[PDB]
Amino acid sequence: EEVVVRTESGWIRGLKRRAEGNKSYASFRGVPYAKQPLGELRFKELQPLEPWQDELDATQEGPVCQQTDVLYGRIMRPRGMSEACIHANIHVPYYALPRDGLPVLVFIHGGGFAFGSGDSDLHGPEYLVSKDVIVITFNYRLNVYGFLSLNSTSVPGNAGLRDMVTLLKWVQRNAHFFGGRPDDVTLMGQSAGAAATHILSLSKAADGLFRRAILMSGTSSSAFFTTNPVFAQYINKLFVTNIGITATDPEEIHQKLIEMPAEKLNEANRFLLEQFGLTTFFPVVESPINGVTTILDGDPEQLIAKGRGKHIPLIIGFTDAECEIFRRQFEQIDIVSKIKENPGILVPLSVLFSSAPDTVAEITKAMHEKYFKKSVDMEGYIELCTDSYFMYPAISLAIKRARSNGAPVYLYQFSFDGDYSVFREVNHLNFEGAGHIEDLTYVFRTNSMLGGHASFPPHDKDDHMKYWMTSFITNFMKYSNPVTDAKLWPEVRADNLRYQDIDTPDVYQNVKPHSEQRDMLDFFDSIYNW
Ligand SMILES: *[C@@](=O)([C]S[C][C][C][C][C][C][C][C])C(F)(F)F
């Protein structure tokens, strides 16, 4: 019932739990991977862990990083919220735990960089850990805590991404203790999580922390956000303003923030949440700064152009109807109204802050005319968001990568319309196809919503998909290929783009993109190099 293991900084006691079927795994949750960013540490890079004595309780996840969840609703059930959220959770096939190795999976959770967690409410390791692999999830600093940017020495920006690097390093040292191979770590993420993963993959400061990666609906340059420096300044100076600060010196603004109570910050960020919908702060291209681990030293797009991350083989995913999943919140913020008021919302934040005055204008035009003929309306935006924020970015990445003489790349389109869909349930949705985050649910067990359901062996259609999806994930992390028959799901070829169409459990098929998809590509290409 109580399992014990040693880690570099001390002993920890996890729990022996059940995976699908009879399978069992040791599970250590809430383990600290660094000093908690609590005082003068709130926004600064994570400090090393003072060692501890006795056995650290790694029975369950710890609290969740300060945030305001404008999306998950009851799907996520945090055991509390605190700035002392920097913990990871490690799950391992019981038989594999050393007592004097396995491939490991590090997962970065989505939530627009502003909310979410690495908890098992949404991230159940049950399916995965049933495939002979170690699963590692964790929390990183969110919204203002992890992405504030003062282009200063104390807050150069990207603290959130640094937390990931800190944890990937912690994994390198501690992998063996769990019976895992640090030489075979696979990084995965979805949404902001996937975008962060892609970004790390371009960071020379993350070299050697993982052998390959999985991008589930997210990329370093996906349009749903921006790494633009001007924008950072804007939103930041807009926060400090709204928050009552008046100081101007980078450091002084900092101190005031350091001494500000959590709640005052949470309210001030929830202010921006109202203004932008589902995100607030973001990663930024940073300037070199004194004694600073530069996570991002350039525009992702230009970095990629020079093959800056082409040696990390990866799986690039995206769903059928990505943004159908957001309808409920699109209404709450009333995007239709917002669009009428800000016709630039249709334009990638990255272009608005980069392109030239007349340029923007014309694009702003083009975009509007493109999805809104008779009237600015919901479905029109949902189309926009899906293509622009997910589908386009994914395919454009598959293509660009396949023609840079780099590592392999596998592209997929999740279109499976499950019998049971947690997110449509919680939000009362109704649409065809697969919306954003759903493929993630056939790889992780949504423990906060399932019951005592048994998924493996599969019997219903849905569990069969669970089996198939989690198999692509473990094969990749085992053989750097999502399939055991190289021809069932071929690497991406530039001369012939095709994606594995995930739709029916146990049926392979790489197909070309539909007409619209091709049209969307061209359209979006012309727009991006206008
Ligand atoms: C995921 O991390 C994707 S983040 C997408 C945020 C922008 C969506 C459009 C907002 C328009 C107002 C997750 F879904 F957040 F988890």
Q: Please choose from 325, 326, 382, 387 the residue to mutate so as to test ligand 1's pocket, defined by most ligand atoms within 8 A of CB.
A: 326
CA distance linking residue 528 with residue 345, whole number of Å: 16
Tokens 């990207």 locate to 158
Judged on CB neighbours under 10 Å (0-12, 13-18, 19+), 330 is buried
CA distance linking residue 424 with residue 435, whole number of Å: 9
Residue 20, classed as helix, strand or coil, is coil
Which of 27, 191, 404, 455 is catalytic? The answer is 191
- Do the Cβ atoms of 329 and 274 come closer than 8 Å? no
Q: Write out the residue range of the structural domain in which residue 302 sits.
A: 1-528
322 given a catalytic annotation: yes
Residue 528, classed as helix, strand or coil, is helix
Residue 136, classed as helix, strand or coil, is strand
Do strands 102-108 and 24-32 pair parallel, antiparallel, or not at all (unpaired)?
Answer: unpaired
Query: Which residue's alpha carbon is nearest to atom 16 within ligand 1?
Result: 111
- Do the Cβ atoms of 498 and 399 come closer than 8 Å? no
Measuring from each residue's beta carbon to the nearest atom of ligand 1, which residues come in under 6 Å? 71, 110-112, 191-193, 224, 277-279, 326, 385, 436-437
Q: What is the four-CA torsion angle of 153, 158, 160, 165, rounded to 10 degrees?
A: -90
Tell me the resolution in Å: 2.7
Secondary structure (DSSP) of 286-300: ----TT---S--S-H
Secondary structure (DSSP) of 457-480: S--SHHHHHHHHHHHHHHHHHHHS
Closest Cα to residue 282, out of 219, 347, 232? 232
The phi and psi torsions of 10 (rounded to 5 degrees) equal 155, -175
Q: 278 CA to middle of ligand 1, Å?
A: 6
Burial letters for 242-280: b for 16+ Cβ neighbours within 10 Å, e otherwise?
ebebeeeeeeebbeebbeeeeeebbebbeebbeebbbbb
3-state secondary structure 345-373: CCCCHHHHCCCCHHHHHHHHHHHHHHHCC
Which of 20, 83, 126, 322 is catalytic? The answer is 322
1 given a catalytic annotation: no
Could you tell me the two tokens for 420? 């049971």
Q: 522 CA to middle of ligand 1, Å?
A: 24
191 given a catalytic annotation: yes
Q: Which atom of ligand 1 is nearest to the CA of 329?
A: 12
Closest Cα to residue 475, out of 398, 390, 378, 410? 410
The phi and psi torsions of 191 (rounded to 5 degrees) equal 60, -145
Query: Which residue's alpha carbon is nearest to atom 1 within ligand 1?
Result: 191
CA distance linking residue 520 with residue 525, whole number of Å: 8
Query: Which residue's alpha carbon is nearest to atom 5 within ligand 1?
Result: 112
- Do the Cβ atoms of 200 and 206 come closer than 8 Å? yes
Give the number of domains in the chain: 1
Q: Any idea what the CATH number is for the domain that residue 480 is in?
A: 3.40.50.1820
419 DSSP assignment: S
Residue 202, classed as helix, strand or coil, is coil
The residues, any chain, with a CB within 8 Å of residue 86's CB and separated by 6 or more, are: 32, 33, 34, 36, 37, 46, 65, 138, 139, 140, 141, 163
- Method by which the coordinates were obtained: X-ray
For the chain, percent helix, then strand, then coil, each to nearest 5?
Answer: 35, 15, 45
- Do the Cβ atoms of 29 and 61 come closer than 8 Å? yes
Q: Which atom of ligand 1 is nearest to the CA of 279?
A: 6
Query: Which residue's alpha carbon is nearest to atom 7 within ligand 1?
Result: 224
